[PDB]
Amino acid sequence: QHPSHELLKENGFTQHVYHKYRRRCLNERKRLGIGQSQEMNTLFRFWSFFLRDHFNKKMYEEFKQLALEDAKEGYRYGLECLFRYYSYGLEKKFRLDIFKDFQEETVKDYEAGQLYGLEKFWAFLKYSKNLDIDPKLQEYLGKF
RNA sequence: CUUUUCCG
């Protein structure tokens, strides 16, 4: 019943419901601050799954921006969802712009003293179906 | 693969 799940059903997505639901999550985040909104978490989660089956560039962009604004504040759930999306989604259907984003954020995450991104990227290669990997990122995987 | 079930 929660829009975060209902919008994931076979034919459950409508523009009206999503926008109303997207608005509430954003408003709650603004009101209670970053890392303090239960909905926003739902929206992050809704995003990583939904985009895997229904890629929308503009939606992915908002997803990506909000996740990185959260992570730089210390609340990394949104970024984990983005990484989960990158690994799971690109596995499902490969997109070069998205994969290039994947490599970029994975490097930034590892350079930030983190392992979540690197582990998700490694997992992608393992379950993925000739790609040009970043040489600096290739070195990071070697020590993983 | 940490984040649901009606506070309109």
Q: Give the burial class of A23: count Cβ atoms within 10 A of its Cβ; 0-12 exposed, 13-18 middle, 19 or more buried.
A: exposed
Nucleotide nearest to A87 (CA to C1'): B1
Resolution expressed in Å: 2.6
Question: What's the token pair of residue A74?
Answer: 């210390």
* Structure determined by: X-ray
In chain B, which nucleotides are within 7 Å of a protein Cβ?
Answer: 1-6, 8
Counts for chain A of helices (H) and strands (E), in that order = 8, 0
Cα–Cα distance between A86 and A64 in angstroms, integer?
11
Cα–Cα distance between A76 and A74 in angstroms, integer?
6
CB-contacts to strand B (7 A): A 1-2, 4-6, 20, 38, 41-42, 45, 48, 76-77, 80-81, 84, 88
Q: Could you list the residue range(s) of the whole structural domain that residue A48 is in?
A: 1-144
Report the number of distinct structural domains present in chain A: 1
Cα–Cα distance between A137 and A99 in angstroms, integer?
13
Question: How many CB atoms lie under 10 A from the CB of residue A8?
Answer: 16
Distance measured from the CA of protein residue A74 to the C1' of nucleotide B8, in angstroms: 33
